[PDB]
Design a binder for these strands. Structure first.
Ligand SMILES: CN(C)[C@@H]1C(O)=C(C(N)=O)C(=O)[C@@]2(O)C(O)=C3C(=O)c4c(O)cccc4[C@@](C)(O)[C@H]3C[C@@H]12
Ligand SMILES: [K+]
Ligand SMILES: [K+]
Ligand SMILES: [K+]
Ligand SMILES: [K+]
Ligand SMILES: [K+]
Ligand SMILES: [K+]
Ligand SMILES: [K+]
Ligand SMILES: [Mg+2]
Ligand SMILES: [Mg+2]
Ligand SMILES: [Mg+2]
Ligand SMILES: [Mg+2]
Ligand SMILES: [Mg+2]
Ligand SMILES: [Mg+2]
Ligand SMILES: [Mg+2]
Ligand SMILES: [Mg+2]
Ligand SMILES: [Mg+2]
Ligand SMILES: [Mg+2]
Ligand SMILES: [Mg+2]
Ligand SMILES: [Mg+2]
Ligand SMILES: [Mg+2]
Ligand SMILES: [Mg+2]
Ligand SMILES: [Mg+2]
Ligand SMILES: [Mg+2]
Ligand SMILES: [Mg+2]
Ligand SMILES: [Mg+2]
Ligand SMILES: [Mg+2]
Ligand SMILES: [Mg+2]
Ligand SMILES: [Mg+2]
Ligand SMILES: [Mg+2]
Ligand SMILES: [Mg+2]
Ligand SMILES: [Mg+2]
Ligand SMILES: [Mg+2]
Ligand SMILES: [Mg+2]
Lengths: 88, 154, 179, 129
RNA sequence: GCGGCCCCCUGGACGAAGACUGACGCUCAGGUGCGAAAGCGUGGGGAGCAAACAGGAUUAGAUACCCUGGUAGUCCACGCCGUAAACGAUGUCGACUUGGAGGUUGUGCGCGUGGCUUCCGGAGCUAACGCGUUAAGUCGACCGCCUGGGGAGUACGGCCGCAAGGUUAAAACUCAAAUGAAUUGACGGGGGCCCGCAGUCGUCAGCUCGUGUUGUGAAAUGUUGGGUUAAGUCCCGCAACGAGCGCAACAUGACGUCAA
RNA sequence: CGUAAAGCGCACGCAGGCGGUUUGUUAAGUCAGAUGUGAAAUCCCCGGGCUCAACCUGGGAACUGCAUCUGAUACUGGCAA
């Protein structure tokens, strides 16, 4: 999983504060960081199906949070996907 | 008490020698005024079985709160596979019911009723379903009593 | 009253694992896995059990249970025979044989010329009483079902000392009720 | 997930009565209170009360007559998966008039009898007897 | 599905105390992924085990069971197959509704409080068996599926597959049943305990009934059980309480069986 | 739909169905009233005519619907917080 330090950085960049761990932007940024990190794992470990199920849950959760944010605030949504480099 | 024989059935148990036949008798008894019971008797001979059934029926009678020889409201009764529906009817309707339900309703003093037996129509269970339906039927007075209202408020 | 109840030891229930949850109203608390009965329920439920027993026996009644013979009453103190009440028509013939000429003396001696200790133990008798519509007056302990019992009396009924208190009271109240 | 709070209220009552509970508590709502008011006025429950502010809890005091529970049956009619609305002439009679149907009309939640006298139809919330 | 130990990479669950977001949720046709064993492809590997196969026995025969061997396969890499009694034969999510005894894993002060899990049982439910806060109880949301037994999960068509085959899925025709659970017998190359030189069964110790009680019911109980006896003989216990025919007592063949 | 026929082998998930709680607003669903229409025959009711009946026939009721207009706003939906 993501380190305490790497997590704390992401909360600082995308959150309102260090305490603001709940915001959709932070949550999406955290999921994105771990999805990107795990690409190296699954490149090496192609038949780690059990861990991949956890990755696909991260992907699905991110998709649901982005869809929530899109319909709640299109502008924040647009900013976020630019910063994180997501298609949608 | 009016008494009605609903069904007689020959049953059998096997023994070393062969089969031992015996008879069962299902009966209902009632006062024709909202009191009814059923009895089930077993004996080697038919008349003994009926006598046992009638004795059982007389001691296992329940009270039904009638209205003018019809029901208070639509009732559902269930026992085993037998599900019965009974509804109040107008004067001159008669007992629109199957035989097992008819025998119960007649001795109970229900003159006017619309009924239907769903599921199993096995007489033993239909009679239990019917009496179950009748005994849990509420009159306006007991409804008024439980709710803490007057009958005109109900 | 209550002081003499706990003097005898009415309050001591069974262990908590053996309890019937239907007895939860009557239970006060628990100590070292033993339920303690609330005698503030016992007192009025006991004293009102005396009152209805006064009322029935004033109508030339037949209380079926030393205490019985003191009150001029009937008892079963060995094995309850299944069908002693519901199959009375048959059980009379054993009464007939008992007094035509010790086995029937144990079983039927107390009712030879015809109140429950422990409702769970005397479940057959209570069931028969319910079948024939006879009001039961039972001491119900914490491990016992009170559904059949008409007049519940929440209390111990294992210790002879608690039993002698209850049996003394019902034999007292009904004897004064008949004089 | 929880998708019918009213069916949940009715079930809490049904299960409470079957278990001989003195009262049943649940998360409150304006609609639950409106229904509780009808049950009280028709004499099916003894009393209700709301406690809280951020998270209000509705408590219903259940009533028993001769041992038996007074609410002998209580059934959801209109439900999220199938909404049921009736015109004034087609309002249901529960137990040939001896029970009630609770009806949401444009003049608030009321019994079928009160709806019929007001000349209103509405959504059939539940049958009680 | 996963079992020595060690390291590296990695998924989920749970608890405590807060803080944070603010309905972002539940379910899900089609779709997509994962999916035991066997099997298939290419390349390795091959101790043990072992389809096929060979021989030896057994048997009326013995293409078997048993024995001696033994190839694929079982193992590894990568790809395919997509099925199993893939089962709790029990879809997922949420709420509610008496108890008892355990296991395992957290945590607060012998006493609490969470998670997961096993056994028993209450109401209730169930055709019954049973289920019973891990529901098959009481409700709500959404999906999947059933509509007599066969014909048939077969044919045709489509799709998928290297193949084996999978998946979707009929009809004509044919029967009045097929089926579930439970009951009484009988029977077993099932178990326990006993007996006998080991017209009939058989002089075997059985067979029943009334009333009560249990079961929706066929039925059950009594008549079972602990002892004991030549004996349902007797004693003791026991929802049974009594009674009859047998036993015994004073040759005597119970109820019945074989359309003898 | 445990064992009778019936829970996909298991999951993720688009469409779809469903949606905790408060206020405001809207008035689509829903509800109320009105108006128009819903052919006649038929059915049904009360009458009438063939000696009766069938049959014929007067008036009504019904045609559960649809549309429009005016209201209601609890509940469901939309919108805003
Ligand atoms: C008309 N309709 C579309 C039918 C249908 O609903 C089918 C179904 N499975 O539900 C078919 O299989 C149906 O579509 C269909 O395909 C049918 C058939 O293939 C055949 C064939 O091939 C040969 C004989 C009889 C039939 C058949 C009677 O079963 C056909 C029925 C077809
Ligand atoms: K969807
Ligand atoms: K080999
Ligand atoms: K049974
Ligand atoms: K589904
Ligand atoms: K057929
Ligand atoms: K009997
Ligand atoms: K609204
Ligand atoms: Mg019976
Ligand atoms: Mg049928
Ligand atoms: Mg394999
Ligand atoms: Mg291979
Ligand atoms: Mg070998
Ligand atoms: Mg071999
Ligand atoms: Mg399959
Ligand atoms: Mg398995
Ligand atoms: Mg298993
Ligand atoms: Mg299956
Ligand atoms: Mg687990
Ligand atoms: Mg259980
Ligand atoms: Mg096929
Ligand atoms: Mg095909
Ligand atoms: Mg026998
Ligand atoms: Mg004898
Ligand atoms: Mg015995
Ligand atoms: Mg002799
Ligand atoms: Mg089967
Ligand atoms: Mg099946
Ligand atoms: Mg499954
Ligand atoms: Mg899902
Ligand atoms: Mg809502
Ligand atoms: Mg509108
Ligand atoms: Mg017309
Ligand atoms: Mg709204």
């Amino acid at each position: 999983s993501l380190s305490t330090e790497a997590t704390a950085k992401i909360v600082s960049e995308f959150g309102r504060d260090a305490n603001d761990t709940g915001s959709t932007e932070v949550q999406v940024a955290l999921l994105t960081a771990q999805i990107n990190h795990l690409q190296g794992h699954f490149a090496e470990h192609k038949k780690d199906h059990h861990s991949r199920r956890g990755l696909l849950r991260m992907v699905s959760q991110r998709r649901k949070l982005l869809d929530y944010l899109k319909r709640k605030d299109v502008a924040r949504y647009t900013q976020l996907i630019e910063r994180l480099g997501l298609r949608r | 008490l009016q008494e009605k024989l609903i069904a007689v059935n020959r049953v059998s148990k096997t023994v070393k020698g062969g089969r031992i036949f015996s008879f069962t008798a299902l009966t209902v008894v009632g006062d024709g005024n909202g009191r009814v019971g059923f009895g089930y008797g077993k004996a080697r001979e038919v008349p003994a079985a009926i006598q046992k059934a009638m004795e059982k029926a007389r001691r296992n009678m329940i009270n039904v709160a009638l209205n003018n020889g019809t029901l208070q409201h639509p009732v559902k009764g269930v026992h085993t596979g037998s599900r019965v529906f009974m509804q109040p009817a107008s004067e001159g309707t008669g007992i629109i019911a199957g035989g097992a339900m008819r025998a119960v309703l007649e001795v109970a003093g229900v003159h006017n009723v619309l009924a239907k037996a769903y599921g199993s129509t096995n007489p033993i269970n239909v009679v239990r379903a019917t009496i179950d339906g009748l005994e849990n039927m509420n009159s306006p007075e007991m409804v008024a009593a439980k709710r803490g209202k007057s009958v005109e408020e109900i | 009253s209550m002081r003499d109840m706990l003097k005898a030891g009415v309050h001591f229930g069974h262990q908590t694992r053996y309890w019937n949850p239907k007895m939860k109203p009557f239970i006060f608390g628990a100590r070292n896995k033993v339920h303690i009965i609330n005698l503030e329920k016992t007192v009025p439920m006991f004293n009102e059990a005396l009152a209805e027993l006064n009322k029935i026996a004033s109508r030339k009644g037949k209380i079926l249970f030393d205490a019985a013979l003191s009150c001029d009453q009937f008892f079963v103190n060995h094995r309850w025979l299944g069908g002693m009440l519901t199959n009375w028509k048959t059980v009379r013939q054993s009464i007939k044989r008992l007094k035509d000429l010790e086995k029937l003396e144990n079983s039927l001696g107390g009712i030879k010329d015809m109140f429950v200790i422990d409702a769970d133990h005397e479940h057959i008798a209570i069931k028969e009483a319910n079948n024939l519509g006879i009001p039961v007056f039972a001491i119900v302990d914490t491990n016992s079902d009170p559904d059949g019992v008409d007049f519940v009396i929440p209390g111990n009924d294992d210790a002879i000392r608690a039993v002698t208190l209850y049996l003394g009271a019902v034999a007292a109240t009904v004897r004064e009720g008949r004089s | 997930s929880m998708q019918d709070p009213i069916a949940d209220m009715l079930t809490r009552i049904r299960n409470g009565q079957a278990a001989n509970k003195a009262a049943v508590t649940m998360p409150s709502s304006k609609l639950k209170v409106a229904i509780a008011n009808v049950l009280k006025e028709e004499g099916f429950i003894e009393d209700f009360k709301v406690e809280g502010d951020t998270k209000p809890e509705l408590e219903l005091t259940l009533k028993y007559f001769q041992g038996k529970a007074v609410v002998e049956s209580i059934q959801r009619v209109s439900r999220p998966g199938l909404r049921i609305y009736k015109r004034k002439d087609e309002l249901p009679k529960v137990m040939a008039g001896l029970g009630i149907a609770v009806v949401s009309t444009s003049k608030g939640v009321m019994t079928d009898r009160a709806a019929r006298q007001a000349g209103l139809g509405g959504e059939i919330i539940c049958y009680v007897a």
